[PDB]
């Protein structure tokens, strides 16, 4: 029903401080979904570390940007009060659906 997309950088953030909305939603809603993974949409760069020549040294970058989305699904539409106005979180893509 509802899609709940949690998309944040660190595992110390997509997993931590994110339980506070799963909590409050139990009473108001009627179900919870646990934290379901997703194939993680990630990057890696290369920037030439030198200011001039020397391509033997380039700084090679990586960047996991984790995706456990949780994705609580609710036919119960009384969830919304304690879900979204009440609780708050930043550093994490918070997205809701019908």
């Amino acid at each position: 029903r509802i899609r709940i997309r949690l998309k944040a950088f660190d595992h110390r953030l997509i997993d931590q401080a994110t339980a506070e909305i799963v909590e409050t939603a139990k009473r108001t809603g009627a179900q919870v979904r646990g934290p379901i993974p997703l194939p993680t949409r990630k990057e890696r760069f290369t920037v030439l570390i030198s200011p001039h020549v020397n391509k033997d040294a380039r700084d090679q970058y990586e960047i996991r940007t984790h995706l456990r989305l949780v994705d609580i699904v609710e036919p119960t539409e009384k969830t919304v009060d304690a879900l979204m106005r009440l609780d708050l979180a930043a550093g994490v893509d918070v997205q809701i659906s019908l």
């Binding site: 950088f9 660190d10 890696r44 760069f45 920037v47 030439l48 570390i49 200011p51 700084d59 090679q60 970058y61 990586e62 960047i63 996991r64 940007t65």
Partner: protein
Amino acid sequence: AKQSMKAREVKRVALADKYFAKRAELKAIISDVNARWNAVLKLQTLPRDSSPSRQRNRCRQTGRPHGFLRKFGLSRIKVREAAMRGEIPGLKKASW
């Protein structure tokens, strides 16, 4: 730096979507590859003005084209500088 070289570059972007882009893009069928009609055609080749194909994306702290990254909107070094100091979330050294 070279303040002067930069200054130029800036103003091209104002006109780029204020006297061009939807002023110019007004071509429709009769002036593209769909169809042709020389009337309209030759009088919308008539203004040239500013153009984004005469604009490079540029670094916003150098304005050189060499070693450019769209992705951060800045050049080679003006990524690496920030990135080494650990200012930017989650960029890290390759280590897999």
